[PDB]
């Protein structure tokens, strides 16, 4: 009784909203949490993280999208879309009373055949993974996974930042280093979208309160990371002052003032124009640094300092003293500059020395649109992880045209294996038509005419010849889509082998997880 009513009605509630979350036509939605914070994003997987969900069957499918962010995270909203269509096909079988055991065996036998057909869809492996010319075929369709307002700027900044934010080496094997933090997301309101560029330096938000004199020409700055705050050694507990004679009362203030003077002078003896401080800065320190003109850094807890570990290359030292060059970093120029209309601390390196990291300045008027750009930046790191971790990502037909050819292959798999499951496989073979159904709904196209034309364009394989046209065929997203089926390679629209390999593998067990629930036992609170 739980699967007929409670399971189907609760999942189809959010399934209708996920139809606009996949494809280059993906639409944003407004979600306000219980705290009152408004959230606008076009990614349904990002929605489910902040969304409050009651019914458990939907909460189970949320964790499937979280695992996709660890591996792929690119176009993974189909996990919610495909499972909804698989339940719709299963809904016809639930009313008939077909055994759930035969349903589980239907996906297991199809998963083994699906993974074998993915190895036949690979064409033109890109082994360079360095220059923008070879990465343009990979990066450009990944940009289409998000807002389509500007596909030229987003694709150019990611392809340009390769030599900047990513580690550069002659030949890098054995899982080259990559990090999600290799690109810092800086959201500053104001400025056109075209003003966004890649900077080899680093920018922090804060205003120096002192006499600071920026050194530009000569460069040659010394910077160090300090764990403890800058002051004389402090007692972690609460002590008690002992006063007896006039010597202890008059020299009490002079004791703490003279010791920090010699303590801060040792830092100035090394030619240190800037520092990295994870903790606060005392008032006595800033007063003495007015003569020396040494910077302080108010940045928050080490989660921000983790980026400075690669930039400066300095090990945090609790004691001040005279930091050795091992704990001394290098920065070319430190100056407060105005980028998006505000004055913040900006490290500007024309030609700098920085290790395996950089930043990308984001210029936009709407701060809510910058939230989607941050998710688009994570897709760039996801594209790097997709190339680096496996032996290769190959190429796959994009625009949701991958499973269109897979329907004809799996349909034959059911016929080539007669039995009681022959009709069960055919019901799950045509269940992949939701992908063109989902995109064409947001593409302004009628699936009545378009969908059979997609099967009529691909046919079985091709007419009599030696060649494959269907690998270059896909659904058209454009104002000319009413004319016919546009190609892909001409626009270089591709997908990744690991994208559909990890998604279908998880969606196989996720579809059988909901169908394996006999009854949902709940409780108060």
């Amino acid at each position: 009784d739980g699967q007929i009513i409670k399971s189907i009605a609760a999942i189809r509630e959010l399934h209708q909203m996920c139809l606009t979350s996949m494809g280059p036509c993906g639409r944003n939605k407004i979600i306000v949490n219980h705290l009152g914070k408004i959230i606008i994003t076009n990614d349904a997987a990002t929605m489910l993280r902040e969304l409050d969900i009651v019914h458990p069957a939907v909460k189970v499918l949320v964790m499937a999208t979280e695992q996709q962010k660890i591996d792929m995270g690119d176009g993974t909203n189909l996990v919610m879309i495909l499972a909804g269509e698989l339940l719709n096909v299963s809904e016809k079988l639930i009313s008939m009373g077909l055994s759930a055991v035969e349903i589980i065996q239907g996906y297991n036998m199809a998963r083994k055949f699906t993974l074998k057909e993915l190895d036949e869809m690979v064409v033109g492996e890109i082994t360079d993974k360095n220059d923008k010319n070879e990465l343009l075929k990979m990066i450009k369709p990944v940009i289409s996974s998000k807002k389509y307002g500007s596909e030229d700027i987003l694709s150019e900044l990611v392809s340009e930042a390769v030599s900047h934010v990513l580690p550069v080496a002659q030949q890098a094997g054995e899982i080259p280093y990559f990090n999600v933090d290799s690109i810092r997301v800086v959201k500053i309101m104001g400025g056109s979208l075209s003003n966004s560029t890649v900077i080899k330096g680093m920018v922090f938000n804060r205003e120096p309160e002192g006499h600071v004199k920026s050194l530009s020409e000569d460069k040659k700055h010394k910077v160090a990371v300090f764990t403890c705050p800058l002051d004389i050694a402090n007692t972690e507990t609460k002590g008690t002052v002992l006063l007896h004679n006039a010597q202890e009362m008059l020299d009490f203030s002079k004791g703490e003032e003279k010791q920090i003077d010699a303590m801060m002078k040792e830092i100035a003896d090394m030619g240190v124009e800037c520092i990295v401080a994870g903790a606060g800065v005392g008032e006595l320190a800033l007063h003495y640094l007015n003569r020396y003109g040494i910077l302080v850094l108010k940045v928050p807890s080490k989660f921000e300092l983790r980026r400075l570990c690669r930039v400066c290359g300095a090990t945090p030292l609790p004691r001040l003293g005279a930091p050795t060059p091992e704990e001394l970093g290098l920065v070319e120029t430190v100056k407060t500059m105005e980028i998006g209309g505000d004055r913040v601390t900006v490290f500007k390196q024309e030609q700098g020395e920085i290790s395996r990291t950089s930043t990308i300045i984001l210029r936009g008027a709407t701060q809510n649109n910058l939230d989607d750009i941050e998710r688009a930046i994570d897709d760039g790191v996801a594209a790097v992880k997709g190339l680096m971790k496996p032996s290769g990502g190959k190429l796959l037909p994009g625009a949701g045209a991958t499973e269109i050819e897979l329907i004809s292959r799996i349909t034959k798999y059911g016929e080539r294996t007669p039995g009681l499951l022959q009709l069960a496989i055919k019901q799950f073979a045509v269940a992949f038509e939701v992908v063109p159904r989902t995109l064409a709904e947001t593409a302004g196209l009628d699936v009545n005419e378009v969908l059979p034309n997609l099967y009529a364009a691909h046919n079985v394989t091709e007419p009599g010849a030696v060649k494959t046209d269907h690998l270059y065929k896909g659904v058209d997203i454009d104002g000319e889509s009413d004319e016919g089926v546009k190609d892909i390679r001409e626009e270089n629209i591709y997908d990744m082998l690991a994208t559909k390999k990890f998604a279908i593998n998880v969606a196989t067990e996720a579809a059988t997880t909901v169908l394996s629930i006999d009854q949902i036992i709940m409780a108060k609170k």
Partner: protein
């Protein structure tokens, strides 16, 4: 008041109106069908397998399901034969239009275009699987009535019960010489009196007058009973009627009221038996046949409850038209007599449809499987926009025998997989056995139905789905 539904809400509410009821009637199909219980506003219950009273007593909150009862009345007035295997088809259509309606954003008129094309190909299939048989043989109609009475134990009495109606069948007929065997069996009324045996029923070719004569011991024979269409008041007035008829010298007397003592003097001098008051509707029975002449014989019988009178014309013409008669049904008990009336009263429409279309369509789920294959064959040939909706129509006829399998509780996939070969390719006589739940020859086992049963149903069922596809907005709560 509004109660208006627009957008996707309008289609969802109308489909689920008759969808929940379609699952309730799944136990009403086949000889193994269950018996549904009803709840009236008075708290009473009526236990029967007839779906006509089921949908009437059940009050559905959605007005869309109210038409299905009116659509059921049309099939009951036109056919009304074997509703166990017939009337269930009214709810097997909308249930199969659910999978693709809104999901593909197809406009209902596009589905209407596929509905009109499905009726064209369906009419050719009905008469394709039909086969002609001898129309003058009464033994073929004896086994046909025995197929619809299998819900009770009356099979033991089927010898007298089948011949009870079939004697009236051949008695009426004859509304035309040539173009079609139209008749009217409503003139034959079946009286149900509890007590006695079924063998007490007297039926034969002629006009049966159910009434008594003057005295029970009066002579039971009349040479030519020619038919013609307090104490002081009754003896004077009635004498001015019965005796006045004697001017043309008939030996049969028909009056509205009884005969007094004074009339017995001049009525009995004619050398025959005098018949007292005759039932009102009996005058309309003889009015069809015939001052009437050529009456062969008269006979009167005596039994406690009511008495009998036999009037045999034996020659209608000298063309002519149908004859009317009367039937009395005597059951074994009070509760037994009222329940068995459904099968015997419907026996009039059983042989009435045989005279209409002597060709015979296969029954027992064989007709629905034959149509489902022909609709699946023409789907791949037509293609176009009708590919999806016209293919689902083939699945609608496929779920009808699935309901018959539901009585057994097995897997329809095993049976339907074999029916796509031995039936479509092999012959139209292949079907699902009702008793054993297997695949046997329908003609050899004895399950068959006239063509009018399937013709006037499927054609009406397809046309009944038109009102379901034309729904847009619902307005109620105002006035009429």
């Amino acid at each position: 008041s509004q109660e208006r539904t627009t957008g996707r809400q309008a289609q969802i509410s109308n489909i689920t109106a008759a969808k929940a009821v379609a699952d309730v009637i799944r136990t009403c199909l086949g000889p193994k069908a269950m018996l549904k219980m009803l709840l009236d506003p008075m708290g009473g219950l009526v236990l029967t397998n007839d779906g006509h009273a089921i949908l009437r007593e059940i009050d559905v909150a959605h007005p869309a399901a109210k038409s299905m009862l009116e659509l059921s009345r049309t099939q009951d007035e036109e056919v009304g034969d074997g509703t166990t295997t017939v009337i269930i088809l009214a709810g097997e259509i909308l249930a199969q239009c659910a999978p693709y309606l809104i999901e593909k954003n197809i406009h209902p008129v596009i589905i209407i275009q596929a509905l009109k094309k499905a009726l064209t190909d369906a009419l050719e299939v009905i008469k394709q699987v039909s086969k002609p048989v001898d129309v003058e043989n009464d033994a073929a109609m004896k086994k046909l009535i025995q197929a619809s009475i299998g819900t009770k134990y009356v099979i033991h009495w089927s010898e007298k019960m089948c011949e009870l109606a079939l004697d009236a069948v051949k008695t009426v007929r004859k509304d035309l010489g040539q173009t079609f065997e139209i008749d009217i069996k409503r003139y034959v009324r079946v009286e149900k009196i509890p007590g006695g045996d079924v063998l007490d029923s007297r039926v034969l070719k002629g006009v049966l007058l159910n009434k008594d004569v003057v005295h029970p011991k009066m002579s039971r024979h009349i040479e030519n009973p020619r038919v013609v269409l307090i104490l002081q008041i009754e003896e004077e007035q009635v004498q001015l009627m019965c005796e006045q008829i004697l001017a043309v010298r008939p030996t049969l007397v028909i009056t509205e009221k009884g005969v007094s003592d004074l009339a017995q003097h001049y009525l009995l001098k004619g050398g025959c038996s005098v018949l007292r008051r005759v039932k009102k509707s009996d005058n309309n029975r003889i009015a069809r046949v015939t001052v009437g002449t050529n009456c062969g014989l008269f006979k009167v019988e005596m039994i406690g409850d009511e008495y009998f009178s036999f009037l045999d014309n034996c020659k209608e013409p000298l063309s002519g038209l149908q004859k009317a008669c009367t039937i009395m049904l005597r059951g074994g008990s009070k509760d037994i007599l009222n329940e068995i009336d459904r099968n015997l009263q419907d026996a009039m429409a059983v042989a009435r449809n045989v005279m209409l279309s002597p060709s015979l369509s296969p029954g027992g789920g064989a007709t629905e499987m034959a149509v489902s294959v022909k609709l699946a064959e023409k789907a791949k040939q037509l293609e176009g926009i009708q590919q999806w909706p016209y293919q689902a129509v083939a699945d609608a006829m496929e779920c009808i025998p699935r309901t018959l399998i539901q009585n057994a509780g097995g897997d329809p996939i095993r049976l339907l997989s074999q029916l796509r070969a031995k039936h479509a390719q092999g012959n139209f006589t292949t079907g699902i056995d009702g008793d054993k739940g297997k695949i046997v020859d329908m003609v050899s086992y004895g399950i068959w139905e006239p063509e009018v049963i399937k013709q006037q149903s499927v054609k009406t069922a397809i046309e009944s789905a038109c009102l379901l596809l034309r729904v847009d907005d619902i307005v109620s709560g105002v006035r009429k």
